Structure 1
Amino acid sequence: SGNGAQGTKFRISLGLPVGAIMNCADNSGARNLYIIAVKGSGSRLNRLPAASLGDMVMATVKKGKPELRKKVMPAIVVRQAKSWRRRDGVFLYFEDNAGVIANPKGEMKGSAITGPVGKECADLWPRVASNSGVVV
C-alpha cells in the first residue's frame, strides 16, 4: 500500500490499474480521482502498477474545483468493485471505486467520507477510520 500506514495488510486482488478513475468520497469538493501511481508497486517489465483496497496512490483530479485540480497528490482506496477473497472465506465487492485524498502520512485532506469503507483500509489508516461511517 505505502508508508504512513499503521500495520501490515493481507494481499488482496488488484482492481485498479494505473489510469483508472474512481470517485472522491470526501468533502474536498472533487468529482474524481485519477490514478497515475501506486506506493507498494512491485516493478516488472510491462506490468501496470495496480492499487487495491487500502493502497496508497498518487492521483490528479479531472473533475472538480480548479484549486484542487492540475497537480499531483496522495490518495487512498476505500472501495473497489473488483472482488477479493478475505481469509474468512467470503468473497465480496463494492458498487464502485471510491477514494479519499490524503497527505504523505495518511492524514485526511477532507473531514468526512461518503458511503461505506472496507475494513482492510480502516485498520491500515486509523486517520481514515476516524472520519468514516459504517465499515464494510
Structure 2
Amino acid sequence: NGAQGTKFRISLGLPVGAIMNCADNSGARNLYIIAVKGSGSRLNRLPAASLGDMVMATVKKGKPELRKKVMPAIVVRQAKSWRRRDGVFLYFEDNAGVIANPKGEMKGSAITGPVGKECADLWPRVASNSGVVV
C-alpha cells in the first residue's frame, strides 16, 4: 500500500539511528529511525533508508502524545548526493521525513519545505500533501 511503483536504488545515507526533522505540521520535531522496512539484511550492514523509502521511526522530540510511540515514516529529504536519471547530481538542504499510517495517509494536514520528486512520484498521498516539490 502507498507505493506506486518499483524501488529505484538511489544512494542511501540514512542508516538506523539517524535523526531527521519532521517536515509536517503534525507537531513532531524530529524522527528517530529504528529500522528500515524492505531493506536487505547484509553481513553487519546497518539498514539504510533513502528518499521515498518507508521506515519505522519514533518521535524523539515534540508533543508528549507522539513521544515514545512508533509509526511508519516516509523520507522526504536525504541531504546526500545521489544520481537522478536527469543527468545532474543533487542533494537536499538537510535530512527530513514525515509520519503517516501504512496506507500513506499523512498525519499532518500539509507538508512543509521541498519534497523529493522520487518520493512524490512514488507516494501520491505525499504529493497531495506537498506544496513545494523540488
What residue number does 1:119 align with?
A: 117
Is 2:112–2:132's contact at 8 Å kept on the other side of the alignment? no
C-alpha distance in structure 2 between counterparts of 1:104 and 1:88, whole Å: 30
| Greater alpha carbon shift after TM alignment, 13-22 vs 35-44 | 35-44
- Cα distance, 1:4 vs structure 2: 2.9
Q: Deviations over 1:4-60 (max 9, x none)?
A: 311123210001010000000111101111000111210112000000000001000
Greater strand share, structure number: 2
SS in 1 for 2:60: coil
Is 1:122–1:129's contact at 8 Å kept on the other side of the alignment? yes
C-alpha distance in structure 1 between counterparts of 2:85 and 2:3, whole Å: 21
Equivalent residues in 2 for 1:5-24, closer than 5 Å: 5-24=3-22
Is 1:9–1:120's contact at 8 Å kept on the other side of the alignment? no
What residue number does 1:86 align with?
A: 84
Is 1:54–1:120's contact at 8 Å kept on the other side of the alignment? yes
C-alpha distance in structure 1 between counterparts of 2:108 and 2:31, whole Å: 14
Q: Deviations over 1:50-80 (max 9, x none)?
A: 0000000100011100101101110000011
C-alpha distance in structure 2 between counterparts of 1:134 and 1:64, whole Å: 24
- The alignment-based identity, stated in percent, is 100
Is 2:2–2:124's contact at 8 Å kept on the other side of the alignment? no
- Cα distance, 1:105 vs structure 2: 1.5
C-alpha distance in structure 2 between counterparts of 1:134 and 1:31, whole Å: 19
C-alpha distance in structure 2 between counterparts of 1:38 and 1:124, whole Å: 17
- Cα distance, 1:131 vs structure 2: 1.0
Q: How does the TM-score come out when normalised to structure 2?
A: 0.96
Is 1:5–1:105's contact at 8 Å kept on the other side of the alignment? no
Q: How does the TM-score come out when normalised to structure 1?
A: 0.95
- Cα distance, 1:111 vs structure 2: 1.1
RMSD between aligned residues: 0.9
What residue number does 2:63 align with?
A: 65
Unaligned runs of 5+ in 1: none
